[PDB]
């Protein structure tokens, strides 16, 4: 029944569990044609995609806030593999888009369309500690259409540890992108670093994107992309979406925006179980995360 629910909502593509709506048109994703100046923003879901996207968009627009608010973020920065009737078609939206394109994806690097690798496109990868990701993803299941009932948080965390959620194992995702992040064309970032010292990360992003980091530009980005601003900005908070797609009365997209909400969700027993499993999955990696 829970399992039946998951069966109805998700199916695999290249071994990765995926939203069924996306899979139907996966040939369009597979065959997607990149352009050399495309920039990819890749993340495991609920890792701060929207946050870094808006930072990047600001950098592209030299901090012109009006330009950033002209259309909603999912139109400004198309969601590559996404496909929903009329509202979203990432491939279509990207095809018609003038360059320079910013491309959002949640794909593991093994599933990124070959054209992006072939054209040597720059990629920004952002990750977030798994426990906080799990919390954020849980509420996402609750409030967004296309998800099964996630049950209780402990039940959901069991599915998360097994990678039985859309986009698959968080563990394999971050580890694979960490290996890619050694390339000079791939910038590897942490949500917790953006929380701790936003100015440092913004400046890093500006240099990676080969633009000039003035104090005024950096200050405009920092306040424009702060959680309190983005929460109330209808271009970035997904509130233009109808309730039957995202029911933000249940849980808002811009939910809390902190590091450490896991502490308010994991029980002592669940934390012990998770931590032990995590160490087994991650011990052979030089990738290290902070949970506070
Ligand atoms: N400007 C910002 N500052 C801090 N966190 C942000 C943010 N914009 C979005 N987030 C957080 O990033 C998560 C959404 O990620 P994504 O864009 O990849 O779907 C949510 O986490 P929480 O549910 O823990 O609040 C959301 O609150
Ligand atoms: C496309 C949907 C709305 C947008 C949703 C979204 C929106 C943003 C994001 O980063 C991930 C996802 C995954 C699930 C998507 C949903 C699955 C069905 C629904 O129509
Ligand atoms: Na790199």
Author numbering: 2 to 293
Task: Quote the study's own text.
In humans, there are 13 cytosolic sulfotransferases that catalyze the transfer of a sulfuryl group (SO3) from the donor cofactor 3´-phosphate 5´-phosphosulfate (PAPS) to acceptor substrates, including xenobiotics, fatty acids, neurotransmitters, and steroids. Sulfation of 17β-estradiol (E2) by human estrogen sulfotransferase (SULT1E1) results in loss of binding to the estrogen receptor as well as increased availability for renal excretion, thereby effectively regulating the concentration of E2. To understand the binding and inhibition of estrogen sulfotransferase by BFRs, we obtained crystal structures of SULT1E1 in complex with the product cofactor PAP and three different compounds bound at the active site: the natural substrate (E2), a BFR (TBBPA), and a human BFR metabolite (3-OH-BDE-47) at resolutions of 1.95 Å, 2.0 Å, and 2.05 Å, respectively. SULT1E1 crystallizes with two molecules in the asymmetric unit (designated molecule A and molecule B) representing the proposed physiological dimer.
The crystal structure of human SULT1E1 with PAP and E2 bound to the active site is similar in overall fold and substrate binding as previously determined for the mouse estrogen sulfotransferase. In brief, E2 binds to a mostly buried hydrophobic pocket, with the sulfuryl acceptor hydroxyl of E2 within hydrogen bonding distance to the proposed catalytic base His107 and Lys105, placing it in proper position for catalysis. Also contributing to the positioning are Phe80 and Phe141, which flank the planar faces of the phenolic ring of E2. Phe80 and Phe141 have been suggested to function as a steric gate conferring substrate specificity for the enzyme. The crystal structures of E2 bound to estrogen sulfotransferases (mouse and human) do not reveal such an allosteric site.
